[PDB]
Scaffold this active site. Structure first.
Site, short mmCIF file in Angstrom:
data_model
loop_
_atom_site.label_atom_id
_atom_site.label_comp_id
_atom_site.label_asym_id
_atom_site.label_seq_id
_atom_site.Cartn_x
_atom_site.Cartn_y
_atom_site.Cartn_z
N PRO A 95 71.95 59.79 44.00
CA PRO A 95 71.79 61.19 43.56
C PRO A 95 72.75 61.50 42.42
O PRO A 95 73.81 60.89 42.38
CB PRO A 95 72.18 62.05 44.79
CG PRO A 95 71.75 61.22 45.95
CD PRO A 95 72.05 59.80 45.47
N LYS A 120 71.56 59.63 51.67
CA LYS A 120 71.63 58.56 50.63
C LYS A 120 72.98 57.89 50.83
O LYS A 120 73.94 58.52 51.25
CB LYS A 120 71.45 59.11 49.20
CG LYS A 120 70.12 59.81 48.91
CD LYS A 120 68.94 58.88 48.58
CE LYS A 120 67.74 59.60 47.98
NZ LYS A 120 66.73 58.68 47.41
N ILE A 168 65.73 60.74 43.72
CA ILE A 168 64.35 60.25 43.95
C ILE A 168 63.96 60.65 45.35
O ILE A 168 64.73 60.34 46.31
CB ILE A 168 64.27 58.73 43.75
CG1 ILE A 168 64.68 58.32 42.33
CG2 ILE A 168 62.87 58.22 44.05
CD1 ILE A 168 64.75 56.83 42.16
#
Lengths: 115, 115, 115
Positions: free
Chosen positions: C1, C32, C64
């Site tokens: 990120p 993440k 994503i």
């Protein structure tokens, strides 16, 4: 709206209160209430614009619904150039604007997202 | 093109004139005339990259037509990493690039929008 | 990120190590691994938020797959507001977040692009 302004003008060559006057200007130009307008100024940077490192600025404008067509953005562009050329003592060749449509699902406000 | 480079290197660890050399590099890499290239460097920031606060940089590249495929961006990435690792004395693990296609209706220039 | 935080708090009113704690927070919130999290803090800027130049901050989050729905972003928003209001000593009315989905073809890493 979300306005962000990068400039290689030192802070002390960006007139005091510009963020406040640009907030009010952007409310009027974009037809959005001033209490929804956000402005961020980042001075003292190292910049080239159109191949030149002379004083310059880069404006980014993000908003829902009002920055998504060439016709809307052309009207906005005239106003923001009239304001920023004279506030920053820059020629019109030394400023560029980028316009970015947003949608409400992208905006985190008061610990939620409103759609 | 619009290049923006954030770094936690102090200004005085970013070599003098980087914005000019990155402008010329980006013209050659992206196949765009230098008088259309814009570069903004924002040093002295507080950053983490890949979980680490060691010296690092973040490049963003926005352009019409030339940053929209993995094949184009892979070619660009190799060149911009060769340039920025050595200019900034950073390992390749300490730089990331983001690529953003633009369209002409998004760009305010000389008080209008050209489509 | 990719997290980016603009604030008009002077650097010395942004608590030491915020970029590290925000990196760890964002790993947990976004699900993440921390070694994929990037944070950039830009303090000392001139800002208006919701028409006011009182202390404020603007967070941008790019990733994503995990920042692309209102439901996901509402969950993220609650956590990032709990963290940033207390770290920065700001009311929830003085912070906004923007969420930006990315795709892998947009990311230049170690001189290539991985798809």
């Amino acid at each position: 709206p979300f306005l962000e302004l990068d400039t290689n003008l030192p802070a002390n060559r960006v007139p005091a209160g510009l963020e406040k006057r640009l907030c009010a200007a952007a409310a009027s130009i974009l037809g959005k209430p001033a209490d929804r307008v956000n402005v961020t100024v980042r001075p003292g940077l190292a910049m080239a614009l159109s191949g030149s490192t002379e004083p310059c600025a880069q404006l980014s404008i993000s908003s829902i619904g009002v920055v998504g067509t060439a016709e809307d953005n052309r009207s906005h562009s005239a106003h923001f150039f009239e304001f920023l050329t004279k506030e920053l003592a820059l020629g019109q060749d030394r400023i560029l604007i980028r316009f970015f449509p947003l949608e409400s699902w992208q905006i985190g406000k008061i610990g939620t997202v409103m759609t």
